[PDB]
Amino acid sequence: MRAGIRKALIDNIKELKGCYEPNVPNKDTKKPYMVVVQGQDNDHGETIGFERSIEVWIYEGRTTFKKLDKLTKQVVEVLDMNTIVDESENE
């Protein structure tokens, strides 16, 4: 499921330089880059079943925060309620 989010973010966002796993990138990675941390799975009743939490941590080169606001809006638009297909797991 990491692969689906990473592929979607890379495909749809062009300012993005790369999307990595939690502790992958080194200090010479080119910014802005995103990190896809996977959270808990909790049982949330019969209607929702197990709900998973995800975080897409954006990172930016400390020029100014306005670029980070723009990139946050881009990520939210890309992922919010848009169905994503994970080719690796085929689900």
Binding site: Y20, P22, N23, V24, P25, N26, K27, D28, T29, V35, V37, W57, Y59, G61, R62, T63, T64, F65, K66
Partner: protein, 124 residues
């Protein structure tokens, strides 16, 4: 101490074991409450030496993993003015890991500057 002796000593000891580098300076300037960066490069012949025995700190969290050691010093002549600051940084791509000038001790004699003693991190 006459200044010319200090200049001759620094130039000699740099020339005993010199290394060419390309220090790239990224100076942050305040603009509307945020930083605007201007990247510049400079070249200097410089000697690199051990100044401390220390262990390699490793930092690893969701932002990324990087390990740095704070052992290597640096000694550069007066040919170029250097300033490292909370907002300014100086680094150069030495093989065996990026180098980063943490601090600059300016070797001054009678108010005239004739070289910098300097400290580095080898950000692996």
């Amino acid at each position: 101490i006459n200044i010319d002796r200090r200049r001759k000593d620094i130039i000699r000891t740099i020339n005993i074991n010199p290394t060419n580098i390309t220090i790239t300076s990224i100076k942050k300037t305040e603009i509307d409450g945020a930083f605007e960066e201007t990247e510049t490069e400079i070249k200097c012949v410089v000697r690199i030496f051990n100044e401390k025995t220390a262990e390699k700190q490793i930092s690893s969290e969701k932002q990324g993993t990087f390990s740095s050691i704070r052992t290597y010093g640096m000694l550069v002549s007066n040919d170029v003015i250097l300033e490292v600051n909370s907002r300014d940084s100086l680094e150069f791509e030495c093989i065996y890991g990026r180098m980063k000038i943490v601090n600059i001790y300016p070797q001054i004699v009678k108010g005239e500057l004739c070289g910098y003693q300097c400290s580095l991190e080898r950000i692996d």
